Structures are given as structure tokens and as C-alpha cells.
Amino acid sequence: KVFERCELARTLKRLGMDGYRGISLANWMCLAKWESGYNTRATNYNAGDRSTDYGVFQINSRYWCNDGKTPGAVNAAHLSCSALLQDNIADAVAAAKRVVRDPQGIRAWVAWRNRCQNRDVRQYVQGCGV
Numbered sequence: 162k163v164f165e166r167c168e169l170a171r172t173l174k175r176l177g178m179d180g181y182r183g184i185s186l187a188n189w190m191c192l193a194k195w196e197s198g199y200n201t202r203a204t205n206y207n208a209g210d211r212s213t214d215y216g217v218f219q220i221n222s223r224y225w226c227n228d229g230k231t232p233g234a235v236n237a238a239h240l241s242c243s244a245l246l247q248d249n250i251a252d253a254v255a256a257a258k259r260v261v262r263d264p265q266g267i268r269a270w271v272a273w274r275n276r277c278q279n280r281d282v283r284q285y286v287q288g289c290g291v
Contacts (some may be wrong), residue, residue, distance in 0.1 A: 162248040164199035164217075166190070167289035174291045176254045182261045189257075190285035191277035192270055193217050201253070202246050216245035218257045219270070225256055 164172075170190055173179070179186040196219040197203035205214040207233040212223040212231045226242040238259045244252040260269050267273050 164201070166195075166199070166285070169193065169199050170177060170289040170291050172250065176251065178196070178254060178258075181258055182266060184267050185282070186291055187282040188267060188273070188277060191280075191282045192218045192267070193221070193271045194275050194285060195276050196270065201248055201250060202241045204246070213242070215242045216253045217250055217255055218245075218260075219252065219272075220245050220256045220260070221277075224258060245281045 170186060173189055174186055178184075178189050181189075193199055196214075197217050199217065201217050203214075203216060203219065205219060207213065210223070212221055212234070213228060214221055215226060215228075218227055220238075220242075222228040222242050223234045226240045226245055227234070227236040228242040238256040240252055240256055245256060246255075252271070259260045261267055263269060268278075
């Protein structure tokens with residue numbers, strides 16, 4: 162599923178992401194935007210270390226979800242990576258919350274630092290009613 166901007170914004174708000182661990186909704190939107198283009202079936206293989214990023218938030222198979230083929234991996238969220246490819250993003254949201262529960266916070270995603278951090282992110286939730 163490819164989400165419409167505002168549709169995703171409301172779904173994340175309903176799921177309790179607004180201000181989760183200090184992270185505003187506009188920030189989670191900026192991340193989803195750059196990580197997947199709001200596409201839940203987005204996958205990206207990292208040839209260099211043999212791990213894969215899954216779903217809307219591009220969750221990594223090394224530490225957060227289990228896909229069986231990733232070397233030196235663990236399951237911190239304890240989910241199957243398959244769960245992060247569903248149209249229903251409840252599990253992907255559960256995983257993303259677990260990731261930011263680590264000291265690095267939203268900074269765990271390098272893309273967030275490159276295109277979101279210290280920028281005007283209002284545009285991601287403007288006109289959405291959230």
C-alpha cells in the first residue's frame with residue numbers, strides 16, 4: 162500500500178506517535194517520506210552487510226525484525242520482518258517505537274539526519290487536520 166500524505170498522518174496520530182519519546186508527528190512523517198515514500202511494501206537490501214530494510218519505516222533485519230537470512234542478527238522488537246510489509250501499519254509502528262526507545266532516538270535513521278533534522282518539517286502535516 163502507498164499512503165496518501167494526510168491519510169498516513171492521521172493513522173500515525175491515532176496510533177499514538179505524536180510526541181512519542183519527544184518525536185513530533187511532522188518528524189515521523191519526514192522520516193516515512195524519505196525512507197519509503199509512504200510505501201509499506203518497500204524493501205531495500207544492503208549488499209555490504211547482508212541486511213534488509215523493511216516497510217514504511219525501513220526497519221533493519223539485523224536488530225529489529227527477524228528474516229532468517231541476516232548474519233549476526235537478533236530480534237529486538239521480536240517481530241517477523243514479514244509483519245512489516247502488511248498494509249496495516251500497527252506492527253511497523255510498534256517496531257519504530259521500540260527503535261527510538263534506544264538512546265539514539267530518531268537519530269537511528271541516518272536519512273532523518275540528512276533530510277529532516279534541524280529543518281522546517283511542518284509541510285509534512287500541513288492541511289491534514291492533526
